[PDB]
């Protein structure tokens, strides 16, 4: 839409009030012109046809319960854009300020969110397992990071390369959550998962085995479900990333933590410079060691901690 940039106000899925960037042209649209070529949020109207209609509002106030998933999809896409720009010098997911598009109210009772190769898509959940999935900033940043991966390393979505793909999205989803300082943790999806149960989440990076995911390469899933375990074996890499950042002793191997900022720098360099579509876990280790070497030197603590973390999860 062509029109005038303005700022509206609304309430997100968790009931918090926030300001959002909109565009005025007869209606107020969820179109943010302040970031790249724009952030656009669409209403899929409980259907599966995409993208749906660009979100239009009569008064620039978004306090209806129907509005909430749109507010959060729109706002958290902006935060994720800001993260990649300010921290990694990356302009949107393609590096050239591509427009970011999201559709909310996808289908009925849909307990998931995804990047479809062109846009982000959020279900509303069924009210029991999930509430609308854009309510989690780690979820939004997880999905948008799939777009970054698609335009850089291109990791194919199966077997070890796919598990790496998933882990990269969990890792940067978590780093974005820390960047926004929104009650940050090392869990995935806790804000929108099981509204009736407190303290849980979909996945854990600190302790993947909490929810039955492997935390060591010896426990990797080798069958054919879930595209060869892409959401399962990501736990091995998530645990390694958690160890690099926070440290700890895991299966008797001790890791000195180097912090979240350096973890992000190492993995972003690995992703954008060294990983390829068919990279496996052992090539990820090599890429991460080389990235830390590039950034901090071959005799640094940083290189040593990357090596120890991968040793700890059994990835040689
Ligand atoms: Ca309104
Ligand atoms: Ca959190
Ligand atoms: Ca989280
Ligand atoms: Ca819960
Ligand atoms: Zn994913």
Numbering used by the authors: 1 to 316
Provide the publication's sentences verbatim.
We describe a device and a method for changing the ambient solution of a macromolecular crystal. Crystals equilibrated with the device produce high-quality diffraction that yields refined structures comparable to those determined previously.
The structure was determined via molecular replacement to 1.75 Å resolution with a final refined Rwork and Rfree of 0.17 and 0.19, respectively. For the lysozyme and thermolysin crystals, just a 5 min gradient was sufficient to prevent visible cracking, while α-lactalbumin benefitted from more gradual treatments.
